[PDB]
């Protein structure tokens, strides 16, 4: 019942050889569904369901917004380097924005910026305020507090963003609402007089999962990481005494599983 629409953009002075310096992507319920970069200079679909339900004018419009955003960040990288008295080197602008539909029907919206990986400025739509995290952000705040910008941003976050999120989840309802069962493997290794038990869940969807080690009824988790195909992976290990392998069970909680799975080494 919770749905999320999130857009992020990165502007880099040093993306690496042959790499685009400006990259943006959009996510619906955590699934990547659109992308733009400064090399191809086109906003493109990244799921079947967005491509099937949009048209040429949609992608021309998204492309126009990204291209305009690209130019403003090209300017911004220079503006900020001059504000910071920087003359070269590796610098990055990042921003992310979007909206959430909460399980109670209430709506969240946000838009925030970072320079060189730390907070720069952020918008609070409910109060129409900007928080400048550093002094170099204050001249920006002064501009963004004037003109049409903040009322328009508030309206986008509360109305346009939510309206589009509702469209997208309808377009993608089949794929977004599916369940895929993880294939679980338990694996053990003994080194330095310690038995390390690994429990891996392969290829589950949706993202939320709980994997834990129970002893007889201090775990390290790699978090939830993506596969190439829209499914997810997690690994959880625990350190045990050698010979105690029989005492441990890996428990897997997932929406696709009517009852949690319990796996032995």
């Amino acid at each position: 019942e919770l749905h999320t629409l999130r857009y992020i953009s990165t502007a880099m002075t040093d993306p690496g050889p042959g790499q685009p310096w400006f990259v943006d992507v959009g996510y619906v319920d955590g699934e990547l569904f659109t992308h733009y970069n400064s090399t191809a200079r086109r906003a493109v679909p990244r799921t079947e369901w967005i491509a099937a339900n949009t048209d040429q004018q949609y992608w021309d419009s998204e492309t126009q917004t990204s291209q305009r955003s690209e130019q403003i960040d090209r300017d911004g990288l220079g503006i900020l380097q001059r504000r910071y008295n920087q003359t070269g080197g590796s610098h990055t602008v990042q921003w992310m924005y979007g909206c959430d539909i909460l399980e109670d029907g209430t709506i969240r919206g946000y838009r925030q910026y970072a320079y060189d990986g730390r907070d720069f400025i952020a918008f609070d739509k409910g109060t129409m305020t900007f928080t400048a995290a550093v002094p170099e952000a204050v001249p920006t705040k002064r501009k963004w507090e004037e003109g049409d910008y903040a009322e328009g941003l508030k309206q986008y976050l509360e109305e346009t963003c939510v309206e589009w999120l509702r469209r997208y989840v309808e377009y993608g309802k089949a794929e977004l609402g599916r369940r895929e069962r993880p294939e679980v493997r338990v694996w053990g290794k003994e080194a330095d007089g310690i038995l390390t038990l690994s429990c891996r869940a392969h290829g589950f969807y949706p993202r939320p999962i709980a994997v834990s080690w129970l002893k007889d009824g201090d775990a390290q988790s790699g978090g939830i990481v993506p596969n190439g195909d829209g499914t997810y992976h997690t690994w959880v290990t625990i350190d045990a005494q050698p010979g105690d392998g029989d005492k441990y069970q890996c428990r897997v909680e997932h929406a696709s599983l009517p009852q949690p799975g319990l796996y032995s080494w």
């Binding site: 949609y58 917004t65 503006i79 921003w95 920006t140 910008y149």
Partner: peptide
């Protein structure tokens, strides 16, 4: 749909 930013 995306929302452009404005001049820094």
């Amino acid at each position: 749909r995306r929302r452009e930013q404005t001049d820094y």
